[PDB]
């Protein structure tokens, strides 16, 4: 996260760290959506241009964390993967269309003050909140600058941007399965996700029922916090029928 701030304790209790077993390193962010299911970006698991293709046993999920590097004894919980599910129409060849994946845990995680799931939006909360100008919140342990790493989880609030401005900011083809967020050059304020924030959540607090909903997934950007560029997020509601199908099918 560029130009964000340290998270408060328990501010993002659905935050998940994707951790490589050997060598031990951060791989991505992710989010807790139930006691057995974790949501992330497909490119965190599968991205052939970079020779990335992880299998369940290559990975761990670390839940309840605040510090990036320390082992947070009696607070974080570490879980093994039963199965990875990537969207069958994830487009890694071109533009990361449908950049979404699910991970099922081998065992349910115990909720605590630091570990708690986020809601997924229904059609109406999405239609009400996914509007240009409305702000969401992005969190992660990724780079502090485009070209270092934070001591603790970082947070930044960013406005959703009008789709024509998103489209006009880039030569990549954008789709309805994406939205973009970030300040414009003339807006004074800045902030972005960056490398290592991949797969983490973009959340909004509904003013109707005061619950947090995950509207996006950190997907892609061209640089980090560049003027006139915007961060792109997977549109969770547009892909929810897939999410539900998987969870309904596989438990």
């Amino acid at each position: 996260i560029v130009e964000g701030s340290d998270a408060e304790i328990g501010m993002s209790p659905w935050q998940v760290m994707l951790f490589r077993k050997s060598p031990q390193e951060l791989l991505c962010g992710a989010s807790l959506i139930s006691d057995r299911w974790v949501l992330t970006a497909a490119h965190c698991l599968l991205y052939p241009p970079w020779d990335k293709n992880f299998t369940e046993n290559d990975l761990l999920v670390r839940i309840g964390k605040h510090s990036r590097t320390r082992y947070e004894r009696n607070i974080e919980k570490i879980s093994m993967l039963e199965k990875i599910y990537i969207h069958p129409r994830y487009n890694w060849r071109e533009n990361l269309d449908r950049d979404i994946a699910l991970m099922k845990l081998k065992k349910p995680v115990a909720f605590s003050d630091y570990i708690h799931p986020v809601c997924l939006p229904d059609r109406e909360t999405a239609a009400s909140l996914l509007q240009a100008g409305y702000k969401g919140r992005v969190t992660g342990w990724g780079n502090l600058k485009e070209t270092g790493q934070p001591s603790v989880l970082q947070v930044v609030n960013l406005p959703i941007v009008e789709r024509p401005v998103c489209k006009d900011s880039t030569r990549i083809r954008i789709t309805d399965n994406m939205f973009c967020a970030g300040y414009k050059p003339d807006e004074g304020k800045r902030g972005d996700a960056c490398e290592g924030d991949s797969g983490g959540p973009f959340v909004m607090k509904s003013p109707f029922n005061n619950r947090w909903y995950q509207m996006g997934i950190v997907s892609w950007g061209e640089g980090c916090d560049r003027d006139g560029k915007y961060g792109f997020y997977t549109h969770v509601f547009r892909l929810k029928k897939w999410i539900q199908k998987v969870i309904d099918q596989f438990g």
Partner: peptide, 10 residues
């Protein structure tokens, strides 16, 4: 850079 985690998890 990372503190090692319990062997149990590996």
């Amino acid at each position: 850079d990372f503190e090692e985690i319990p062997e149990e998890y590996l």
